[PDB]
Design a protein around this ligand. Sequence first.
Ligand SMILES: OC[C@H]1O[C@@H](O[C@H]2[C@H](O)[C@@H](O)[C@H](O)O[C@@H]2CO)[C@H](O)[C@@H](O)[C@H]1O
Length: 130
Amino acid sequence: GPPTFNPPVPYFGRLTARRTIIIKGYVPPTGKSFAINFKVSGDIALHINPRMGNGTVVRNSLLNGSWGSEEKKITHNPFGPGQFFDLSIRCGLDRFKVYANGQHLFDFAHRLSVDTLEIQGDVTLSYVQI
Ligand SMILES: OC[C@H]1O[C@@H](O[C@H]2[C@H](O)[C@@H](O)[C@H](O)O[C@@H]2CO)[C@H](O)[C@@H](O)[C@H]1O
């Protein structure tokens, strides 16, 4: 499983527990927002949505066109405009564990009972490795 280099945005990659996904990217200086979606079919098990406008990192799940409760709590925000980030997402048995630049960012408990990776919006990708 070699890394994909300079994948285009919007990105659509086809995808298990204890496996970690690497995403290196870049936030454009004029960026407003971007999204990273772990989807089944158009349902989203984990929606990661950094918004540079108010500096939030919004997490949620999408079932039947309906969003669940938002999770927003963080101790740091690695997604400032004009900055590069090194993101890792480990799929655990009961939750996602997401790190940014080696520092834990958040955990996300599985709500959905995930074979697709979607990345769209104001972001440039350096490489994605599964
Ligand atoms: O929850 C993820 C979801 O949020 C939508 O926007 C929300 C917004 O976060 C919230 O503050 C407001 O009360 O309702 C909005 C729904 O219209 C985004 O539109 C969507 O892309 C997701 O990111």
